[PDB]
Symmetry: D2
Subunit: 415 residues, 4 copies
């Protein structure tokens, strides 16, 4: 009854949970935890640090990362969150090793492997700085990871959520698409789950976070803006949008648009810490519309916005773009992210370098290196590549093990 107490208590009495329904008991959670409590330091400090930041910052902008090096540069650049894109993992970082489109094709433990990758890189960055006493950068920046539609049912979602926390994610996002026909937000052929089925996914995620004993941030996303199909008419709430027309597959045609997005947003809002409307373009008016509707029933709900590379941020005007993030943080969009920054950064950079190189050999490469040296004074250390990867950290381990007598120390003698 005492482990149940120090849980039921926190719910009642913690501002962290104001405007959050949990339609299970603290008795249920402790029945599923098993007989002991396992601490998850990284995911707990993470969840706490992201929650603080979202209330103490004007807003928090992130870029997608599909490597720990990529995330380490985000953090050395001064970003205060990391976005783990399911698209990017599908494209270049999943456990199958295949390039896939964004249709839940990869094995469901792929994203959590990348979260652990990122945290292990950040820890090494922290270990190097600590040993040196060379700077006071907090490398443990919260990671917000894509759980797509949970890769199947309520129990897959549960397992996935447990995986994300084990890995040490600070926040996870679930979308109201059908796992079986899941797509990129900015592709056609999207299929919605009944509102109740999307709400059961969100309860599942939170119950998983409760069993793991961690206040992980849960983002509810809706695809209901473009999505004009749904799997069932079973929820009265959705009958308001169905035409009655049906595809061969059996799915139901629906009136997509900001109305459906808004219907989902208010339904999911009592079960999420942030709400996120996938949009087909970066329309300020629609962002404001979407926000207001949520805020009427859910005053000061933290909202999230995908500043998508699937948009042409130029066909949009130049001064509007410089001010977009500040402009939408205004409406309540306190977590903002460029989903595919890492994919475009990675492909653009290697294509331009390989072409410089094919055309002009090491001259081309010396342009990167020189660009690297000029960037040292701004906090780019990766130019000194052996230090960046912790060659100095492992030298110090060798000196401690050998009491200083090692002749095979790496850094002294290096060229």
């Amino acid at each position: 009854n005492e482990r149940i107490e120090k849980l039921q208590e926190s719910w009642e009495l913690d501002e962290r949970w104001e405007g959050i329904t949990r339609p299970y008991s603290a008795e249920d959670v402790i029945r599923l935890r098993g007989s002991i409590d396992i601490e998850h330091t990284l995911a707990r400090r993470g969840a706490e640090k992201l929650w603080t930041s979202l209330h103490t910052e004007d807003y928090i902008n992130a870029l997608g990362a599909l490597t720990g090096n990529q995330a380490m540069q985000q953090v050395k650049a001064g970003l205060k969150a990391i976005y783990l894109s399911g698209w990017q993992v599908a494209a270049d970082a999943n456990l199958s090793g295949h390039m896939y489109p964004d249709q839940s094709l990869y094995p469901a433990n792929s994203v959590p492997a990348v979260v652990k990758r990122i945290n292990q890189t950040l820890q090494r960055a922290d270990q190097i700085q600590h040993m040196e006493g060379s700077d006071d950068t907090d490398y443990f920046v919260p990671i917000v990871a894509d759980a797509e539609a949970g890769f199947g049912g309520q129990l897959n979602v549960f397992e996935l959520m447990k995986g994300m926390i084990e890995a040490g994610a600070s926040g996870v996002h679930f979308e109201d698409q059908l796992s079986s026909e899941k797509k990129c937000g900015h592709l056609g052929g999207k299929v919605l789950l009944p509102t109740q089925t999307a709400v059961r996914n969100l309860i599942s995620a939170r119950l998983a976070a409760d069993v793991m004993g961690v206040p992980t941030i849960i983002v509810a996303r809706t695809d209901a803006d473009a999505a004009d199909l749904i799997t069932s008419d079973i929820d009265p709430v959705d009958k308001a949008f169905i035409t009655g027309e049906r595809t061969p597959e059996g799915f139901y045609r629906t009136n997509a648009g900001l109305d459906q997005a808004i219907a989902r947003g208010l339904a999911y809002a009592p079960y999420a810490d942030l709400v996120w409307c996938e949009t087909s373009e970066p329309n300020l008016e629609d962002a404001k519309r979407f926000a207001d509707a949520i805020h009427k029933e859910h005053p000061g709900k933290l909202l999230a916005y995908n500043c998508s590379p699937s948009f042409n941020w130029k066909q949009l005007d130049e001064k509007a773009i410089a001010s977009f993030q500040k402009e939408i943080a205004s409406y309540g969009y306190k977590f903002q992210f460029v989903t595919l920054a890492g994919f475009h950064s990675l492909n653009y950079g290697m294509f331009e370098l390989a072409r410089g190189y094919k055309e002009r050999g090491m001259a081309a490469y010396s342009e990167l290196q020189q660009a690297e040296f000029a960037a040292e004074k701004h906090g780019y250390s990766a130019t000194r590549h052996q230090r960046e990867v912790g060659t100095g950290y492992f030298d110090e381990v060798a000196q401690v093990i050998t009491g200083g007598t090692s002749s095979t120390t790496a850094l002294k003698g290096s060229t």
Copy 2:
């Protein structure tokens, strides 16, 4: 048995591929170790045949380090004729432990083979998108040259590692004469050489594995003996010329590190490898010429390999470097850590841009990506790049074309691109 031994025996004596190569074992030994069936390894064969051919056809072949499928994919698209696979890059950002490590054989031994397989599956999906659309004649199956470090242990770990590289579809593999338990990056201190006889055993085990796998995989013998001023032992008469007599606390022996200790190693290894690589501390034309001249006196025409390392300050303005050393026999040239510097510098520049100017910094990259299209860059159309069109073609074939949930038709990539 005599059946399979003879196809093998024939090819060893007839194919110009194995000219100037010794095998100190027999076809009978190879078939004894193979098992009762022959398993085909299509991409490893086609790659080894293509890489060899292009080494005897091009002025030279120049590569960059790839640490992801996408990176390798942009290298092919831009016109490069091989992919270098850096174990350093894998240590740092792409190994199966998920840790950031320095170049010291700390990662799990099957890591580079995993990245080889990744790269190959990316290239296969790139071809499949091209094939389906009949929209270009690009060969996306370019040879991968993979880092086997010092083999992660002895002669059997080398055997296993060499087999892994080939199953994953590597065309070339390099082994270095360092002690595995003390392995380092070429450009760090505290390198410990293996006795020469021991370095020769590893290249022999490497050739046994490729013969057993029935694939003519390229082997690059690498020596670290330019900067490495320790050897595990005085057992090999050939190494006594360079041993000072001084021992370390650990029991290692001091050697006179230099170009001569490298020339000694290069000539020991040249019979047992298809290319030879001397690691160097600076881009020195006269060391490269002397090392080449020393190798060509005993193996005229021997293919040589040069690491144009990012550990050097490319401020040698006396470019024209690749052409110059290619004229000395250096046909395979690669910038080991290109992938790490590209990825790392790239995100840092964008992230700093982003902190400062928000979505304006993102717009600049998009608009640089559109500008690269005339050069043949397609990743700005990213749904097509990762094969959304290919999986809609799979969907349409399964449903006979009634599929309602096809992806591209009604995507922001149709309207806005």
Copy 3:
């Protein structure tokens, strides 16, 4: 047009494909293969060897294996196929490392990792025998692997099938359950896919087998015997069984039983090489019923039967059990398998050994060892444990590399 030829030809003209519909062109397959052909020796010889065996044997009985050692003993015992149970992988051999029930909880590339495991063990067994010339056992025995419901949609099935072939499976089985609510055949709460959706999975698998250029054997399984729920009324064919009643989730109540099993079996039969009816008990009468109905429309269709450890093969009579397999091979069930033999073999053996050991120490262990020695003369080599794992094979590699001068050879000096 010539790679299309040496495909369209095989279909028309190969007995292997008699009574098999492919509702796509050879043009479609070659459009998806890409520009070259990759040989898969193991999966091709496998598919050929299993197909031969099923026509040249009275029938083929298998046991479930969740390790390569387990499969090596099956083969040294004289079995001619191996059954890769999705249940067992869920229980003790999946890439997540968790014990799960049989509800598609594990990552979707888990089963193909176990097929590659098994083939790598068998190859080592073949390499040892070859080197020695000590016996002529064919260790490359066909593996028949569980693809559950494909872990999502038509494209997951496709990817999974490709995975199974890459791994070197000789046969794969897909079931007409909903991936999202998938269960063990012998559990409650089963949910059927529309017949057309189960038929699209099977086309998907075969198209994948066609792109991979391998005549992989495809088993269609139905859960329609116990399963009394279905996801949609969209297929006219299924309206014959729905009551019109609906659960909260939205699913449709159905009249389960041999009639529904038979409806699915004839629907799936033109798209599969074997048909398999999951049954709630080992009823000879129902097995015969099921067979006859299939054979009327599909004369001499190869059928498959799960002799399930979920049955009490004793509450069944003793002489009926000794003759069951021969009895049902009679009706056309030429592929028969004990799904969970490996799970029960593994848990029973370790529990009885640990208890013997707790009670009587090394005396207990010497009973196993003595049981092991008596079993040598029947073809159990694992008693000589260093040879079993290829210590001799790697010694011979060391002698070849060193030209015989090795002083660190393993076997000479062994105790």
Copy 4:
């Protein structure tokens, strides 16, 4: 900094845990290497504390090799108080390459940690099923003792491996004094010893890693020097007593293999380990007594570890063996390859049964499983065993109990069991 150094410094000087243990490094060094935060490792701590406690409380602790969660799970259920994790078994049937290997460090170095994590996740699910039902008071969190072989390389690979073991929730880890590139099973020929100073460095690196991970993980120093008649080098004065002068082609040195070379190693290692293990070629009571007496003269009460190996013909009928050697100080006793013999013999007996008598052979096993239930065997009810009841309880909590698709109600395990 002084904060964290002192909790550490305190515990080293006060806790009876570290009595008779040297650290040749400082708390300051440990905190310098940790990073800026303390990460907790619950199962590694609770396990190390439980294993230590039970080693000072029980006549002795006896274990069998587990190579799967299920196997470990049956060992706990049957009443055993630890699980041995064999690297040999992992080589053979349970490593991350998926190959069958002999005991020679050919598998990927993160393999045993993966099996440690597997076993722990199985035990966690076993507890969760027990907890949910309030149906027994069994402690399923029994200490796992894991094989780190010779570390897969040098002092840094040992450091990394020791960290992996702890993250995965190992309670104890053993390191052996063999050369990694030549590692063997204890009972094969061609074992090559590391110089003593080198074996000591590895146990020091092992303790640094556990101190840095802030967990009191048990370390077992193992010596192979009873049968191993080669050493890599003559560098260590302590080893000159046993070196004959004869060198091998490879440069290894001949040593006088025996109990004396083992006693020399055991006493070198005892200061740097929590238990000491002498590998032996036969179950000899007088060697075990002499080895124990030699260790207890310098470290009275030192905990000792005995491998009751399946490589021996248990026909020593002069059982009562475990009690006898436990009386000599051998508190941790384990049958390394039990899991492999259990799994292998078990399927072969069943498969031969099955070829001969079909489903009658299966019925016998079922009926043996029912007979074991009175002893407390539950796996015959297999849907419950793998937690079908636990995931139906998860389903009911998510749906508030309207779930139609719960699994057990209307299963053959309800009716027929």
